[PDB]
Amino acid sequence: APDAALAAVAALPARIVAAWADHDADRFADVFAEDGTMILPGLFRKGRENIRTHMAAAFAGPYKGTRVIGSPIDARLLGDGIALLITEGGILAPGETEASGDGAVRASWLAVEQDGQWRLAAYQNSPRGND
Template identity: 50%
Template sequence: MTAETTRTRAVDETAARAVVDNVGKAWADNNPDAFADAYTADGTMILSGDRFIQGREVIRAMAKQQFATAHKGTTLLQNVIDVRPVGEAGAVVITDGGVLAPGETAPHPDREIRATWVLEKQDGNWLIAAYQNTRNADGRLPGA
């Protein structure tokens, strides 16, 4: 691997982590616009179970509704556990974490998730092309 490749991968990892951090900040601020603007125009979300959301404006509407109701006052814990460049304009990020209720420092086991983020660089900006999360509880064996 050349020094240039190593430097580019480091920049990509920094940029990828910034996308995750910005989504967390938008969530903490209950800012549906900043949250949705992190996605490509045709970005997708697959949330635990079978909830499929497609398109930045649909994501914006969903975030607006959720930040006003179920997720009002919550924050996200998103620990980046892996970042891998994909070509010159893509990256895959894996995170562990979940939704934190006010006062929590760790998510309740029912709200622990692992997520996959597929990022795409468009016009110099890193955006989320696809996001999918799975509740850790969904993968636990009964009695575990």
């Protein structure tokens, strides 16, 4: 369970980063549990399908041509098959090398094991600040 957890919660951001690199809302949403939630400044989406349709629009608009960066800052096992990862990083526009302003965030990734597979029950980000 501890080993299983730690690598599982490493896997979830990797999949999100890969989906973002291809601006692929389908692979992005598929990381989430069916009733998973995403909370960002100015946004709440509940359910994999709602996350999917939102990212489809977002990738076509405000997130077009951007890339994601991040590094882990905390990870905890909360119980059998449930883990929380906290990362810092954010979204870079072309020409940027480090996340800044509203693009710089801390994110929480609540991972749950369902059907022998880990999925994101909840993602949330908040501005990193100090900047």
